[PDB]
């Protein structure tokens, strides 16, 4: 089972290498989306 633990490392490396490319490709869009939603949420302050 510790050999299975050792075999987990390549899966972890593949996951990290994929998620790095995913983040570097689509992170500015997600930050913009969070900014849009929080602007919409804070926009309710004055007019209710």
Describe the protein in words.
This protein has 48 residues and is mostly helical. Helix content is 85%, strand content 0%. The protein is built from one helix and no strands. It has one helix at 2-42.
Q: Note the beta-strand portion.
A: under 5%
The rounded distance between the terminal residues' Cα atoms is: 59 Å
Q: What radius of gyration results from the CA coordinates?
A: 20 Å
- What is the overall number of helices? 1
Which structural class is indicated by helix and strand composition?
Answer: mainly alpha
Protein name: Cytoplasmic dynein 1 heavy chain 1
Subcellular location: Cytoplasm, Cytoskeleton
Family: Belongs to the dynein heavy chain family.
Note the main attributes of this structure:
1 chains; mainly alpha; 48 residues; 85% helix
Task: Describe the secondary structure blueprint for this structure.
Blueprint (H helix, E strand, L loop, with lengths): L1 H41 L6
Describe what is shown at a glance.
The PDB classes it as motor protein. The protein has one helix spanning 2-42. It is an all-alpha fold and 48 residues long.
């Amino acid at each position: 089972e510790a050999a299975e633990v050792t075999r987990k490392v390549e899966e972890t490396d593949i996951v990290m290498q994929e998620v790095e490319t995913v983040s570097q490709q689509y992170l500015p869009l997600s930050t913009a989306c969070s900014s849009i939603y929080f602007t919409m949420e804070s926009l309710k302050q004055i007019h209710f």
